Amino acid sequence: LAHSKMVPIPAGVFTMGTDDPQIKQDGEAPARRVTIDAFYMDAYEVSNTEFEKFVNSTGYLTEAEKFGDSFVFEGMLAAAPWWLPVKGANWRHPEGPDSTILHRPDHPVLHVSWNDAVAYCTWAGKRLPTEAEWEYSCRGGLHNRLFPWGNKLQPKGQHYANIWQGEFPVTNTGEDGFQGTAPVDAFPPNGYGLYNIVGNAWEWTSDWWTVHHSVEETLNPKGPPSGKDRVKKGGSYMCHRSYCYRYRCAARSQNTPDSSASNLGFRCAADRLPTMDS
Ligand SMILES: *[C@@H]1O[C@H](CO)[C@@H](O)[C@H](O)[C@H]1NC(C)=O
Ligand SMILES: [Ca+2]
Ligand SMILES: [Ca+2]
Ligand SMILES: [Cu+]
């Protein structure tokens, strides 16, 4: 395994957002042309094993551990009736104190806040991606498509991401092979070599959240200078067209930076390769 490996994301200009927004309240529109300098993106969501290396090295206690609770989706035992604050839920105990990560070391780390993610990425010699970098990377070299791979959810009759199948929230059929998370290296890569960029775990980005965007062309944009919530991208194993259609590269949501949940993780980015881990 090389679950901290990065891929080179080429310099380019791309269309961020969409003039055909599917969730208008989220500021998916307007489409705008954005120029991105070449950089590096983690191929994988940060896994439990990789996060454990960080905690072993630094002693870091995550925010959910210090607060003593985190949000867990009821279907695997608040923003919605299916989100419950569970005492003792955290990255090591993703459904609460009687759950474990021992059987899922290669799954994405969960219950990590924005601050926890920044701490990990900086320890790794990296950083969070901006929203524009994240979306450009998600799109995988394709223009104005719904998904990293194109416009069909199941191209060639194949599942390409870990989302929900069945009637949410009562029945997840696990048709795609995974009820909860999947290993970080599951499913096909996109055109840039990224795995699970849509689905699996949601992913923090560095930007403050706003829904007000201009059509002006921009260069390496960082988002607004202030805010109260940080932007997350890409959707999760819970998403379904019927209620939360956020497994599209253009989709976007937000949470306060001290937030954490059982469907929210991250990956890192870097301007240049960090020191080789000998
Ligand atoms: C973290 O440290 C513990 C205790 O030394 C060890 O058992 C475990 O394998 C370490 N985890 C990683 C990912 O190195
Ligand atoms: Ca699934
Ligand atoms: Ca993901
Ligand atoms: Cu969703």
Q: What is the largest CA-CA distance in the chain?
A: 51
Ligand 2 mean position, distance from CA 27 (Å)? 27
The total of structural domains in the chain comes to: 1
Query: Whose alpha carbon is nearest atom 5 of ligand 1?
Result: 56
Q: Which residues line ligand 1 (CB under 6 A)?
A: 49, 52-53, 56
Residue 179's domain comprises 1-278
Query: Whose alpha carbon is nearest atom 3 of ligand 1?
Result: 56
Rounded Cα–Cα distance for residues 246 and 178 (Å):
18
What values do phi and psi take at 176, rounded to 5?
A: -75, 0
Report resolution in angstroms.
Answer: 1.0
